[PDB]
Amino acid sequence: VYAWNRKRISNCVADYSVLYNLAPFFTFKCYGVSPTKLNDLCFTNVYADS
Amino acid sequence: PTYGVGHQPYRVVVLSFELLHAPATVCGPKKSTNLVKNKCVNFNFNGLK
Amino acid sequence: ALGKLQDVVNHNAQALNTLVKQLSSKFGAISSVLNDIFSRLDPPEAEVQ
C-alpha cells in the first residue's frame, strides 16, 4: 500500500464486460460514471493502481 | 486465514479518467459510420452526443 | 442627445443576453450539458443531478 504501483493504459479498446462479468470482482462501484455506462463512451488519460 | 473477515488482504484497483476535455484514445466496442452534410441529423463524435 | 431610447435597447439586449450566458452555469451539478449527464450516470443518479 505504501509503495503502490501506477500503470498507463492507452491505445486499447474498452471492454469492461470481460471484467464486470468476471466472478471474483464482487464489488463494482464507481463514482463519476455509472457502472454499466463504461462501454458507451471513449476515454483517455486512463491509469490503474495496484 | 485465522483472522476473521475484515482482516483478510483485499486487492484494490482504481481507474482514473478525464471526460471529453481532451482527444480521447480508449474507445468502446462501438462502430463508426460515414458522415453526412446539410441534413438535420444527430451525431456521436467521440462521446458528444 | 437621444440616449434615452438607446438605454432601452441596451437594457433589452443585456437582459436577453444574460439568459444565453446563464446556460454555462453547472448549478451544483457535474456539468451543464444534458447529454453527458445522461450518458455517465445510472437512471437514479441522473434524475438527482
UniProtKB/Swiss-Prot annotation, chain A:
Attaches the virion to the cell membrane by interacting with host receptor, initiating the infection. The major receptor is host ACE2. When S2/S2' has been cleaved, binding to the receptor triggers direct fusion at the cell membrane. When S2/S2' has not been cleaved, binding to the receptor results in internalization of the virus by endocytosis using host TFRC and GRM2 and leading to fusion of the virion membrane with the host endosomal membrane. Alternatively, may use NRP1/NRP2 and integrin as entry receptors. Binds to host ACE2. RBD also interacts with the N-linked glycan on 'Asn-90' of ACE2. Cleavage of S generates a polybasic C-terminal sequence on S1 that binds to host Neuropilin-1 (NRP1) and Neuropilin-2 (NRP2) receptors. Interacts with host integrin alpha-5/beta-1 (ITGA5:ITGB1) and with ACE2 in complex with integrin alpha-5/beta-1 (ITGA5:ITGB1). May interact via cytoplasmic c-terminus with M protein. May interact (via N-terminus) with host bilirubin and biliverdin, thereby preventing antibody binding to the SARS-CoV-2 spike NTD via an allosteric mechanism. This is Spike protein S1. The chain holds residues 350 to 399 of 1273 of the full protein.
